[PDB]
Design a protein around this ligand. Structure first.
Ligand SMILES: O=P(O)(O)C(O)(Cn1ccnc1)P(=O)(O)O
Ligand SMILES: O=P(O)(O)C(O)(Cn1ccnc1)P(=O)(O)O
Ligand SMILES: C=C(C)CCOP(=O)(O)OP(=O)(O)O
Ligand SMILES: C=C(C)CCOP(=O)(O)OP(=O)(O)O
Ligand SMILES: [Mg+2]
Ligand SMILES: [Mg+2]
Ligand SMILES: [Mg+2]
Ligand SMILES: [Mg+2]
Ligand SMILES: [Mg+2]
Ligand SMILES: [Mg+2]
Lengths: 345, 345
């Protein structure tokens, strides 16, 4: 899975989605806006790695009865995966505005383009609303239609709650370091990342396979939230220690005063002098201050701590998969974990 | 219609909407965020005129069979009206960021308030998503559920297209005055205002009354698009000439270079010297340029021009209402026009 041919099949759907949203004989009185929206979609939607959309297809293929897999049902699963990518695209447009970011996917953040600015808020809302038009076109005659619409709206609401908890790291221009606990961290990640990134693809595949039992969705959730916590911890590590040419994004968490995994572990490990460095220099726009924090992270050994976590967490999650209900395919969870951890074994 | 008793009935539902979204035994691990969202709702949702929500109820009462007007079905119509008010609240949060506005509904705009700022961007999305949670709680077992959610999806998408066309007034910091025609103006207002403000309340009332005839919906739409353009022309007059203590908002259209009705009519009426004033001073950040344009609008007699237009258009719209058939109650459309004609807020 996550093969070159699966990517080919998935990518082939995107031009049809753009046609559905911008050139299907609708809104023929406002071609200026529809032609612009095609450019919004081209810049912002297909420019990532598509792990969430591809995972929606893989989940469906592993949950559906083999006999029921047809080219037509697999294409439906691919359309659902593009609906997840429309949600991702929307969330990153708004996130980059909120985080004052420079680059995304190796190009300027959308809001930084000429004649965009705060119009990016509208483009964010427009890209998310688009997915419900796609759902109506392709799924309106199936039993899974309403549960899928409701899952997208509920996951959006949850993601908004997580984005708000993430944003509340700062008050009056200074970080609330005494509240930067691992408990707070885990709550932020659950809501701002794990539901939409990991739960949504798998629950979509379950619904398209006519699996409505809330206990099956809950058994999946326990594993998927553990994978999501690693995924966001890795993101946080790379914000400070990654190469922006490889990640496609310039880090901002130290300047923005975020309750990142690095900040939480730094506060756990700091002696009183190091805690005073955090108090003085964390969450400041001055470049000296951001470099002083990075130097503290190096002094505290946080890169080795992250490398240990990447190894240990893989093995803990693999053990937990073994304990999932016999009713769910254990190999779906192993495949997701292997892709996220960039391991074949 | 728009009576004290109808207002009391409608406001009585608001505390239950807040409870539904923030205190219904959900998300009990993140009370910081749920308590803050209760404040977001309190500030941003209920302090406007509530004409859209009240119109949803009036439409339902005038479309349903009298024998079916139970406490419970009238309450459902009020809940649908609050869902339109949630959509409105979401749009205004974003709009005030995009328009760089100072006040809304008599208070500083949400994004300007202490420790809000760019958090207002997530709050806008969160308020929008919340209306679908309310629809799910109350409507999910009723035949109107899918038509209602599909209508909200479609109206959202159309509103985003209008907000985009509205924003394309300026390119590289100068207004595209050669393109400020009445044809452009009518297209902008149809999409950014008329669908969500007038079509949505009346179509919701129809759906709750189990009225699905595509031809009845189309005849209501035709008149409601005329009403929406009239209403937006009034809004544009208030931006330049309203009393901000009565309207609750300080105008920005001249500074933001908007294709307002006043700008379109100023370009139609201007001599060559007056056109050069528009070219030089429209859509500038400098207070002195905006005052030059306001003074041009005064000298052109745009207040009296608006007054004559509003009276002429009220009479044309009422002539068109008299021509409505398809079993639609003329008095619903007359009551909407009576409520807005000659408004100062
Ligand atoms: O660090 P963030 O949460 O802002 C991020 O991971 C985006 N995001 C937003 C919600 N969940 C994740 P990115 O580093 O891509 O800017
Ligand atoms: O003039 P706008 O369109 O920005 C406005 O009417 C808001 N709006 C946004 C879309 N439709 C209407 P407001 O004057 O309330 O700021
Ligand atoms: C939740 C996080 C870490 C946001 C970035 O997600 P990805 O790294 O999957 O981004 P794209 O491939 O879509 O660019
Ligand atoms: C579409 C428009 C003109 C936006 C403002 O609507 P209202 O003037 O109805 O504002 P509130 O009563 O909701 O504050
Ligand atoms: Mg970010
Ligand atoms: Mg962020
Ligand atoms: Mg990050
Ligand atoms: Mg505005
Ligand atoms: Mg506006
Ligand atoms: Mg206005």
């Amino acid at each position: 899975s996550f093969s070159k041919e699966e990517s080919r099949e998935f990518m082939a759907i995107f031009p049809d989605i753009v046609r559905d949203l911008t050139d299907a004989g609708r809104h023929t009185d406002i071609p200026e806006v529809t032609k612009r929206f095609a450019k919004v979609l081209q810049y912002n939607v297909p420019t990532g790695k598509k792990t969430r959309g591809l995972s929606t297809v893989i989940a469906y293929k592993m949950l559906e009865k083999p006999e029921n897999l047809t080219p037509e049902n697999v294409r439906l699963a691919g359309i659902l995966g593009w609906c997840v990518e429309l949600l991702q695209a929307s969330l990153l447009i708004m996130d980059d505005l909120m985080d004052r970011s420079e680059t995304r996917r190796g190009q300027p953040c959308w809001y930084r383009q000429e004649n965009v600015g705060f119009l990016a808020i509208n483009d964010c809302l427009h890209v998310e609303s688009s997915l419900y038009s796609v759902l109506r076109k392709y799924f309106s005659h199936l039993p899974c239609y309403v549960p899928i619409i409701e899952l997208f709206h509920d996951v959006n609401f949850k993601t908004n709650m997580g984005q708000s908890l993430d944003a509340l790291c700062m008050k009056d221009g200074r970080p609330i370091l005494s509240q930067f606990t691992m408990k707070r961290y885990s709550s932020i990640v659950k809501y701002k990342t794990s539901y939409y990134t990991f739960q949504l693809p798998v629950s979509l595949g379950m619904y398209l396979a006519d699996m409505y039992d809330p206990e099956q969705h809950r058994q999946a959730k326990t594993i998927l939230m553990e994978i999501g916590e690693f995924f966001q911890i890795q993101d946080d590590f790379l914000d400070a220690f990654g190469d922006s040419q490889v990640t496609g994004k310039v880090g901002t968490d130290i300047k923005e005063g975020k309750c990142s995994w690095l900040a939480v572990v730094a506060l756990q490990r700091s002696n009183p002098a190091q805690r005073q460095i955090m108090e003085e220099h964390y969450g400041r726009p001055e470049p000296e201050s951001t470099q002083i924090i990075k130097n503290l992270y190096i002094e505290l050994g946080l890169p080795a701590t992250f490398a240990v976590y990447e190894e240990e967490s893989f093995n803990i999650i693999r053990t937990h998969i073994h304990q999932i209900s016999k009713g769910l395919p254990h190999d779906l969870f192993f495949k997701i974990m292997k892709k996220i951890y960039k391991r074949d074994a």
